[PDB]
Write an enzyme that holds these catalytic residues in place. Structure first.
Site, mmCIF file in Angstrom:
data_model
loop_
_atom_site.group_PDB
_atom_site.id
_atom_site.type_symbol
_atom_site.label_atom_id
_atom_site.label_comp_id
_atom_site.label_asym_id
_atom_site.label_seq_id
_atom_site.Cartn_x
_atom_site.Cartn_y
_atom_site.Cartn_z
ATOM 1 N N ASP A 140 53.014 51.407 48.904
ATOM 2 C CA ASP A 140 51.928 52.801 49.756
ATOM 3 C C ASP A 140 52.203 53.997 50.756
ATOM 4 O O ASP A 140 52.213 53.706 51.668
ATOM 5 C CB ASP A 140 51.148 51.654 50.736
ATOM 6 C CG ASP A 140 50.038 51.820 50.789
ATOM 7 O OD1 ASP A 140 49.515 52.993 50.026
ATOM 8 O OD2 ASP A 140 49.258 51.526 51.425
ATOM 9 N N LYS A 146 52.408 57.355 52.042
ATOM 10 C CA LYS A 146 51.020 58.784 52.278
ATOM 11 C C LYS A 146 51.505 58.333 53.659
ATOM 12 O O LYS A 146 51.837 57.846 54.125
ATOM 13 C CB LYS A 146 49.705 57.481 52.603
ATOM 14 C CG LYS A 146 49.632 56.570 52.808
ATOM 15 C CD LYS A 146 47.649 56.448 51.916
ATOM 16 C CE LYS A 146 47.982 54.790 52.754
ATOM 17 N NZ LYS A 146 46.570 54.404 52.739
ATOM 18 N N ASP A 174 53.590 50.090 57.359
ATOM 19 C CA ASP A 174 52.519 49.520 56.405
ATOM 20 C C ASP A 174 52.815 48.956 55.289
ATOM 21 O O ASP A 174 53.368 49.096 54.217
ATOM 22 C CB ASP A 174 51.603 50.411 56.121
ATOM 23 C CG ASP A 174 50.424 50.487 57.292
ATOM 24 O OD1 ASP A 174 49.537 50.354 57.499
ATOM 25 O OD2 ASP A 174 50.190 51.869 57.765
ATOM 26 N N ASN A 184 50.755 56.212 57.004
ATOM 27 C CA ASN A 184 51.902 55.386 56.706
ATOM 28 C C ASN A 184 53.498 55.635 57.183
ATOM 29 O O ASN A 184 54.156 54.637 57.466
ATOM 30 C CB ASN A 184 52.255 54.270 55.279
ATOM 31 C CG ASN A 184 50.524 53.954 55.186
ATOM 32 O OD1 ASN A 184 49.796 53.754 55.382
ATOM 33 N ND2 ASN A 184 50.611 53.057 53.989
ATOM 34 N N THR A 205 47.536 52.947 47.362
ATOM 35 C CA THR A 205 46.182 54.380 47.668
ATOM 36 C C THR A 205 45.571 55.508 46.028
ATOM 37 O O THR A 205 47.019 55.405 45.583
ATOM 38 C CB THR A 205 46.532 55.300 48.619
ATOM 39 O OG1 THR A 205 46.754 53.977 49.950
ATOM 40 C CG2 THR A 205 45.190 55.764 48.844
#
Lengths: 20, 350
Positions: B166, B168, B184, B171, B201
């Site tokens: 995840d 991004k 996260d 995070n 995502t």
């Protein structure tokens, strides 16, 4: 422009993950 | 020259030894996790700093020391209901076992009748997401500074058989010094060989995830490419209002770059953002070293990044402990703790 298109999109806030 | 080859030679031997030591440390904690090292009534809850599907992260103050922490609170009943027990158990087990400069730091965890709690070091710089959207885009040196920390963090996680899934800007927390802490870990997993869960995502999903293929840690290197692109451009390489439209772009094998991207950046990104697994940087026989030795990273002193001796090209400002000006405002909600234990067997390892 791509920037204008991004800013006008629904995808500039915090994005949620999917898990399903 | 010859000095550079000697330098590279001894630093790689030094990373291998560091990594084998780090795997022994991790495995000890991974196989025998810490439990129940604090309690809720020991913290004043100050401000919500973020939310998620099953809960929220709050700035809190540990009343006995006066230290500030970030406390994640998850509602056990919401977790079961949405069938996500395994993912939340993964997150805590991993966080309690890892140790690296660019990871969030779990200090305490505990549970009560209603909720799970993870108390972590407070990173007052806010999410990279907030600075990226406000500023618009990062210069290449700024983006590279952050990307270098991700590369080392992924080298570290992957060597522990962890997949992160995840990445991004949302995070990535910024600390007082302007360095990153990856948060996260909800979708992170320890796996040897293939995994199948459709998660992540949309904008950051690797094509092999979208294609229901079976996948591995190469998805994290793809995500790094998306991250580097978004940092340097101000927008991600694949976006659209409907997720299906994003997925079609991801799997098409086509990416366009802004005209201001350096040749070297474009080349790094074409290699990270490869639909063909057998061609993606991070996933070839030299693995991570193909990324570390790419020309875009020529100015990067990898060891100095690890040691946090590089001057951050950007540092958020802050006025004293417990300041939250680098965070958005969220609706607050009182924490009700039930009289009856909920989901006790399901979360017994937590």
């Amino acid at each position: 422009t791509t920037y204008a298109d991004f800013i006008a999109s629904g995808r500039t806030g915090r994005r949620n993950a999917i898990h399903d | 020259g010859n000095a550079a080859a000697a330098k590279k030679g001894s630093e790689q031997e030094s990373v291998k030894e560091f990594l084998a030591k780090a795997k022994e440390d991790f495995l000890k904690k991974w196989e025998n996790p810490a439990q129940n090292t604090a309690h809720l009534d020991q913290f004043e809850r100050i401000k919500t700093l973020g939310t998620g599907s099953f809960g929220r992260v709050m700035l809190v103050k540990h009343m006995e020391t006066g230290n500030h922490y970030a406390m994640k609170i998850l509602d056990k009943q919401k977790v079961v209901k949405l069938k996500e027990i395994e993912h939340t158990l993964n997150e805590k087990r991993i966080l309690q076992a890892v140790n690296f400069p660019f990871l969030v730091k779990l200090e305490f965890s505990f549970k009560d009748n209603s909720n799970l709690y993870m108390v972590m070091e407070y990173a007052p710089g806010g999410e990279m997401f907030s600075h990226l959207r406000r500023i618009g885009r990062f210069s290449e040196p700024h983006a590279r500074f952050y990307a270098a920390q991700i590369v080392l963090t992924f080298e570290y996680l992957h060597s522990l058989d962890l997949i992160y899934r995840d990445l991004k800007p949302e995070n990535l927390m910024i600390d007082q010094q302007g360095y990153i802490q990856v948060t996260d870990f909800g979708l992170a997993k320890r796996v040897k060989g293939r995994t199948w869960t459709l998660c992540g995502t949309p904008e950051y999903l690797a094509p092999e995830i979208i294609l229901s293929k079976g996948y591995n840690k190469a998805v994290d290197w793809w995500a790094l490419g998306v991250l580097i692109y978004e940092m340097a451009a101000g927008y991600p390489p694949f976006f659209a209002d409907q997720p299906i439209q994003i997925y079609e772009k991801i799997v098409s094998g086509k990416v366009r770059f802004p005209s201001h991207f350096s040749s070297d950046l474009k080349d790094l990104l074409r290699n990270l953002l490869q639909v063909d697994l057998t061609k993606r940087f991070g996933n070839l026989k030299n693995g991570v070293n193909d990324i570390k030795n790419h020309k875009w990273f020529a100015t990067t002193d990898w060891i100095a990044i690890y040691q946090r001796k590089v001057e951050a090209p950007f540092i958020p400002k802050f006025k004293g402990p417990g300041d939250t000006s680098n965070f958005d405002d969220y609706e607050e909600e009182e924490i009700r703790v039930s009289i009856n234990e909920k989901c006790g067997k399901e979360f017994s390892e937590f």
